[PDB]
Amino acid sequence: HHHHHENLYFQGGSRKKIFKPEELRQALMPTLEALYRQDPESLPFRQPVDPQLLGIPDYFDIVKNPMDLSTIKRKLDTGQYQEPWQYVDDVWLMFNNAWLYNRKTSRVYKFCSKLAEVFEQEIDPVMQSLG
Numbered sequence: 218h219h220h221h222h223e224n225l226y227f228q229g230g231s232r233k234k235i236f237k238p239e240e241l242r243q244a245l246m247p248t249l250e251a252l253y254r255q256d257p258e259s260l261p262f263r264q265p266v267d268p269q270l271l272g273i274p275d276y277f278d279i280v281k282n283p284m285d286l287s288t289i290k291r292k293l294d295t296g297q298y299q300e301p302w303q304y305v306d307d308v309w310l311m312f313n314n315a316w317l318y319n320r321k322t323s324r325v326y327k328f329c330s331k332l333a334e335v336f337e338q339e340i341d342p343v344m345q346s347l348g
């Protein structure tokens with residue numbers, strides 16, 4: 218959760234601007250696209266986890282707030298984010314759920330780490346420009 222330390226405007230205080238959905242798409246969709254471009258690493262993250270399909274019925278005992286790339290895409294596509302930090306926190310939620318649910322020595326854990334590396338590189342300059 219180190220990103221809470223930077224861009225303190227998103228952490229708290231009074232409203233200084235209204236982000237329009239188009240503004241957020243233009244700034245943020247490229248960072249999401251960067252994750253989708255990771256093949257094979259994005260494949261476990263392009264749809265919500267389906268416990269019955271994947272044989273992991275305990276999934277929702279562990280992960281209370283599921284998230285995935287397609288949901289994040291949809292929220293950007295339909296204007297459901299009011300501010301950029303909400304998008305960033307959903308990306309981190311997706312990664313944190315995967316790292317929580319999966320052992321370190323499983324494929325999905327490894328793929329999560331790769332995607333997290335890619336995201337950090339793409340997002341940092343973007344969030345500076347929006348803060």
Ligand SMILES: COc1ccc2c(c1)c(C(=O)Nc1cc(C(=O)O)cc(-c3cnn(C)c3)c1F)cn2C(C)=O
Pocket residue numbers: 257260261262264265266267270271272273314315318319325
């Ligand atoms: C069996 O144990 C687990 C445990 C956690 C998993 C997954 C599996 C997982 C996953 O396998 N997602 C997934 C889902 C689907 C789907 O159709 O819903 C498809 C793939 C997939 C697509 N192509 N490939 C090679 C794999 C895919 F990787 C995604 N997970 C997450 C994000 O935690």
